[PDB]
Design a binder for this molecule. Structure first.
Ligand SMILES: Nc1ncnc2c1ncn2[C@@H]1O[C@H](COP(=O)(O)OP(=O)(O)OP(=O)(O)O)[C@@H](O)[C@H]1O
Ligand SMILES: [Mg+2]
Lengths: 47, 727, 390
């Protein structure tokens, strides 16, 4: 499949030492078997 | 080493741990005499019972109540705080009936405080039952701290994870210098609304000690007008009530309380301090310049701007006003009114004489003169209100474009319902013109001053809901966001609903809307997550420009408290303009200016100079206006000299010469008597007055080519609205 | 005349006593610094014709010294072999930067004019340049108030207030000696100037201007002062000038005459024929009686600052500074050392404090005591016959 060119992503926000605190505060506030046959057609790619 | 007697003590410890239980408890606990020793570290029994730590811990595990199990916990927990043995064993010991700490040392007290803190962070809202014993603990420790002058550590415990009132309430008296200033600094640098928590904590300290001309200014930091009246209520001494009224105006006996609040005599005080070291001298532009040391309407505008910025409010026109050529607009009439600032007495007469005069450029200027003169002074007999409300109601530019900014000048920072009802219905401006709608939003916001007025917010929201796709992304339609921001200042996270509502606006626009709303919101306090957001929104490369511009202005506005933060932001902005796009480069000077207005530090001056002579005229204009803003109201030296060198370099550049001469006029602005600096009190107030003017000025100068070199000039007189005396 | 360079200094958290306020402030520094680093990494990672032209440019470009430009496209250059050539001039040079003595760039094979290298400052001077900001601001300078005021008038005020002098035609002082006994603050009052001065600071050591090659010293000095003038409205700190400053004598050796030549070039720079820009010279010395009037003159050295052994009040303030960051014991009165009129330097006070802390540490303690201060003084101090007077 065509390799989906991914967006040029950055590095994380890094620890500003109250990033986790702010995230926690916001969070608290918010609170098939494969078959056993093939049945090949008449020209059969039989390896 | 192990001197013979030291080894004998070690052998005593060995026998004690190897050997019923009452003597063991007695002597093992008394061996903490080493820690209680007023003059010693390295408590010998601590670290002599190091190999026995595991044995003692397992013995306690396999221990049951009785004669033992009571005082052995003390030794277990001291050996713990030395190594391992957390608050589970600490509180088991305390339940062992020893919380006094008298038999233990300051070292153990501090270690216990830290241990309590770290369990509190480790825990969540669940298992809150354990907190209550820990609260009684903290209550038992804090008196020990106020005894042994560990006030920093006590305030640490109080600020820890939350807000606390009991201690600073029970912090004795006449020793509050620390709890005052040190907690003021902690406040200045807090990241959360527990800022406001520490704010009213310090306020309560002041109130308990019945000396609060510091909670005076703390009132403004506490965005609670109700608290403002609460402080105003007591005012048991008229002598201090007078000072409080003067402070309120700058930012029983009812005859003069409202008079001082409205500052009907601030003009008298300013003129008296002018007489003190008199500089009263109607002047000529060249002297502010030095053209001897080396008649376009552009030169007329430059001369008028410098003259007004210098002689503002000194009470000293049509003859020299008459030289108009297209862009020869009401600038000079507003300049005369400004030179007459706060002089209502003669202001009425002069403005009436020059309003009964020629076409729009003489009547809109008169209305702006009335408003700008009324700025900063109020009275029961409302001045200029009748003229503003009756005249100039037709749909058109010029007239209302000036009149609405005049009304904002008259009654900015009032939140008065009468002018609100005057301006909100008139905000409907799809009938009128686009710049008129912009200035109407400007005045509405400048009066709102962060009032969070639902009505004005609705007006702005409906105006922006009225959308013309091509009009939005052309120019001169960003003052709806500006007014929204002015209506909402520093209220914290109470902006998400507005952001969600605005999220319907078209993608190419509304970047400015969101950014300017966000910056007019939380700012001055300093939030690292927020400035991270600002820097990242700058950092997404776009191969929009004004979006990064507003982001830059926001970094400036947010980094206006902590001087440490301001300097680091200077570093960041140097990086930005170095590795930045032209829009980002243009925006950087505005941020520098906001960081240091009228505080001309050599570093900012040097950086702006080095970036001045740029290939982009917009960059050059931004840099030279940044020079003007850093030097404003200071007469600072060598700024004029280097600026004249810059002018001579740009000898034949018309726009550059005009703007640089404006920068010189700013440099000599107010002859030092007026400064644009925010933070009037203790350099610690995001002053609702003049922040609106400064922010409007910076937003407008985000694009200088289109608006400034266009059909409008009221930005300069908005900056004047921001002006304030330095005496 | 490129313009001031100065140094980059991070802000200084006001508290020094170990405090959660200090922790918070320093974490503020941390977070803005991390933010700067992010922006850098993100933007510079997350985000033709001149390339081929510079490829055509000779990759191992050499450096010559231009001499007697000729014509519009044919300039004479030299080489580091004593040879010289009539080289060609390409279309890549800005032109008008080519002056005799200019250190030009040349192509390895073609030997053409392929650059101007308007950046060549000798390594012996660029290493001496100052780019760090030594944390010694005017807060640890106990007392010395008059000396600090004079040095501030000399160094700061013609930068942060160039209006007082222009208002009355006077011109600011150009040079200041700091002279005195062994340990008074003559170098602290230079460090603090480096701190608070937004102007370039230039280390200098007198023992650094004496060069092996004959005639090289009175070229290193010219390089130093040319760098000072060109690169900034700056300050030049010649520490220990008594290393070259001795009085000129007739002499009978080569080295002494060479040292005197270095002196003469220094003097010609300070006040020569032509002029001096905004370079302010700060010189230091232990003995001012052993210097040449030529450099002690009040045209090159407009101010002289004694640093007398600090008096009683200054000595008190110095103990205050150098014990402030220590856990003192309430039984310690910092006056036993003050009252005694024994020659005590600022460095001597510092050493007393350090040694006292050490004696406590040996006593197995981390907070000073009066006996510890007594022992520290007694074991630190290093060094008229009785009855001849009185
Ligand atoms: N006023 C002062 N306050 C504090 N420390 C001082 C003071 N004066 C001198 N010192 C001490 O000076 C030491 C540095 O040496 P100082 O600058 O005194 O030497 P100097 O003899 O004047 O000059 P040089 O370093 O050229 O020999 C520092 O450790 C500092 O402790
Ligand atoms: Mg020294």
């Amino acid at each position: 499949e065509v390799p989906k060119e991914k967006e040029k992503e950055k590095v994380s926000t890094a620890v500003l030492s109250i990033t986790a605190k702010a995230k926690k505060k916001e969070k608290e506030k918010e609170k098939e078997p494969e078959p056993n046959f093939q049945l090949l057609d008449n020209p059969a790619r039989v390896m | 080493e192990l001197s013979e007697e030291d080894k004998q003590l070690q052998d005593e410890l060995e026998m004690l741990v190897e050997r019923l239980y009452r003597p063991a408890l007695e002597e093992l606990r008394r061996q903490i005499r080493s820690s209680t020793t007023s003059m010693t570290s390295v408590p010998k029994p601590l670290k002599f019972l190091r190999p026995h730590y595991g044995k003692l811990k397992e013995i306690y595990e396999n221990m049951a109540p009785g004669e033992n199990k009571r005082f052995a916990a003390d030794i277990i927990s001291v050996l713990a705080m030395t190594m391992s043995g957390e608050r589970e064993c600490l509180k088991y010991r305390l339940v062992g009936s020893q919380e006094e700490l008298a038999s233990w040392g300051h070292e153990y007290v501090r270690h216990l405080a830290g241990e309590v803190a770290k369990e509190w962070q480790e825990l969540d809202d669940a298992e809150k039952v354990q907190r209550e014993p820990l609260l009684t603990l903290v209550k038992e420790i804090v008196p020990y701290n106020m005894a042994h002058n560990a006030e920093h550590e006590a305030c640490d415990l109080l600020m820890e994870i939350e807000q606390v009132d009991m201690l600073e309430k029970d912090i004795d008296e006449n020793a509050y210098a620390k709890v005052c200033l040190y907690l003021t600094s902690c406040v200045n640098y807090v990241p959360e609304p527990e800022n406001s928590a520490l704010l009213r904590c310090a306020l309560g300290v002041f109130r308990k000690f019945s000396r609060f001309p510091e909670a005076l200014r703390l009132a403004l930091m506490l965005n609670d007008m109700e608290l403002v009246e609460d402080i105003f209520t007591s005012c048991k001494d008229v002598v201090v009530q007078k000072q409080m009224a003067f402070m309120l105006g700058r930012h029983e006996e009812y005859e003069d309380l409202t008079e001082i609040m409205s500052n009907v005599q601030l003009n008298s005080n300013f003129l008296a301090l002018a007489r003190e070291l008199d500089i009263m001298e109607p002047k000529v532009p060249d002297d502010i310049y030095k053209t001897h040391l080396e008649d376009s309407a552009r030169m007329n505008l430059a001369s008028s701007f410098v003259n007004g910025f210098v002689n503002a409010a000194f009470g000293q026109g049509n003859k020299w006003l008459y030289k108009n050529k297209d862009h020869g607009m009401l600038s000079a009439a507003a300049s005369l009114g400004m030179i007459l600032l706060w002089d209502v007495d003669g202001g009425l007469t002069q403005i009436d004489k020059y309003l009964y005069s020629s076409e729009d450029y003489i009547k809109s200027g008169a209305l702006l003169a009335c408003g700008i003169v009324n700025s900063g002074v109020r009275n029961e007999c409302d001045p200029a209100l009748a003229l503003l409300s009756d005249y100039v109601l037709h749909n058109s530019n010029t007239m209302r474009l000036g009149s609405i900014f005049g009304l904002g000048l008259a009654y900015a920072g009032s939140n008065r319902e009468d002018v609100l009802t005057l301006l909100l219905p008139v905000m409907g401006d799809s009938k009128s013109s686009m710049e008129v709608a912009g200035v109407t939003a400007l005045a509405c916001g400048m009066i709102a001053v962060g009032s969070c007025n639902g009505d004005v917010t609705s007006t702005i929201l409906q105006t922006i809901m009225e959308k013309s796709e091509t009009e939005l992304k052309d120019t001169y339609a960003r003052w709806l966001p500006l007014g929204l921001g002015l209506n909402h200042l520093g209220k914290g996270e109470a902006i998400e609903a507005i952001l969600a509502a605005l999220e319907v606006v078209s993608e190419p626009f509304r970047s400015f809307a969101n950014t300017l709303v966000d910056v007019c919101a939380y700012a001055g306090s300093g939030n690292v997550l927020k400035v991270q957001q600002l820097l990242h929104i700058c950092s997404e490369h776009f191969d929009m420009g004004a979006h990064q511009g507003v982001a830059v202005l926001g970094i400036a506005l947010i980094a206006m408290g902590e001087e440490i933060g301001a300097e680091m932001a200077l570093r960041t902005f140097g990086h930005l303009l170095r590795y930045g796009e032209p829009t980002l480069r243009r925006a950087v000077p505005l941020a520098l200016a906001l960081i240091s207005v009228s505080n001309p530090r050599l570093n900012i001056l040097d950086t702006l100079s080095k970036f001045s002579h740029d290939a982009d005229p917009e960059v050059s204009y931004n840099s030279i206006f940044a020079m003007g803003m850093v030097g404003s109201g200071t007469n600072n030296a060598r700024l004029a000299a280097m600026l004249r060198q810059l002018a001579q370099y740009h000898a034949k550049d018309p726009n550059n010469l005009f703007m640089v001469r404006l920068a010189q006029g700013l440099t000599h602005l107010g002859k030092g008597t007026l400064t644009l600096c925010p933070y009037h009190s203790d350099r610690q107030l995001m002053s609702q007055v003049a922040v609106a003017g400064l922010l409007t000025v910076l937003v407008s100068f985000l694009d200088v080519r289109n608006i400034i070199l266009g059909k409008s000039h009221y930005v300069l007189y908005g900056l004047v609205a921001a002006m304030q005396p330095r005496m | 005349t490129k313009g001031p360079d100065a140094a980059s200094k991070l802000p200084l958290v006001t508290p020094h006593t170990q405090c959660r306020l200090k922790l918070l402030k320093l974490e503020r520094i941390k977070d803005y610094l991390l933010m700067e680093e992010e922006f850098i990494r993100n933007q510079e990672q997350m985000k033709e014709e001149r390339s081929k032209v510079d490829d055509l440019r000779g990759t191992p470009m050499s450096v010559g010294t231009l001499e007697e430009i000729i014509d519009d496209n044919h300039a004479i250059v030299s080489t580091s072999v004593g040879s010289e050539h009539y080289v060609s001039i390409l279309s890549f040079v800005d032109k008008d930067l080519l002056e005799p003595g200019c250190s030009v760039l040349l192509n390895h094979k073609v030997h053409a004019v392929i650059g101007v290298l308007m950046d060549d400052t000798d390594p012996l001077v660029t290493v001496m340049k100052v780019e760090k900001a030594p944390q010694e601001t005017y807060a640890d300078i106990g007392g010395l108030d008059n000396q600090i005021q004079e040095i501030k008038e000399s160094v700061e005020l013609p930068l942060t207030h160039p209006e007082y002098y222009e208002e009355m035609g006077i011109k600011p002082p150009k040079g200041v000696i700091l002279y005195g006994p062994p340990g008074t603050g003559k170098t602290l009052l230079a460090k603090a100037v480096a701190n608070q001065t937004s102007a370039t600071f230039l280390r200098v050591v007198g023992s650094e201007l004496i060069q092996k090659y004959l005639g090289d010293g009175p070229k290193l000095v010219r390089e130093l002062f040319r760098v000072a003038e060109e690169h900034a409205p700056s300050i030049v700190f010649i520490d220990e000038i008594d290393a070259i400053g001795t009085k000129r004598y007739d002499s009978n050796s080569g080295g002494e005459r060479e040292i005197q030549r270095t002196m003469l070039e220094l003097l010609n720079q300070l006040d020569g024929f032509d002029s001096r820009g905004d370079v302010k010279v700060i010189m230091a010395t232990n003995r001012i009686e052993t210097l040449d009037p030529a450099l002690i003159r009040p045209g090159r050295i407009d101010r002289k600052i004694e640093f007398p052994l600090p008096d009683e009040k200054t000595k008190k303030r110095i103990f205050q500074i150098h014990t402030s960051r220590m856990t003192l014991a309430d039984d310690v009165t910092l006056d036993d050392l003050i009252m005694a009129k024994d020659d005590l330097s600022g460095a001597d006070i510092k050493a007393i404090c350090t040694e006292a802390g050490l004696m406590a540490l040996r006593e197995r303690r981390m907070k000073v005591t009066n006996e510890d201060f007594k022992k520290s003084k007694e074991n630190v101090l290093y060094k008229t016959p009785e009855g001849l007077y009185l």
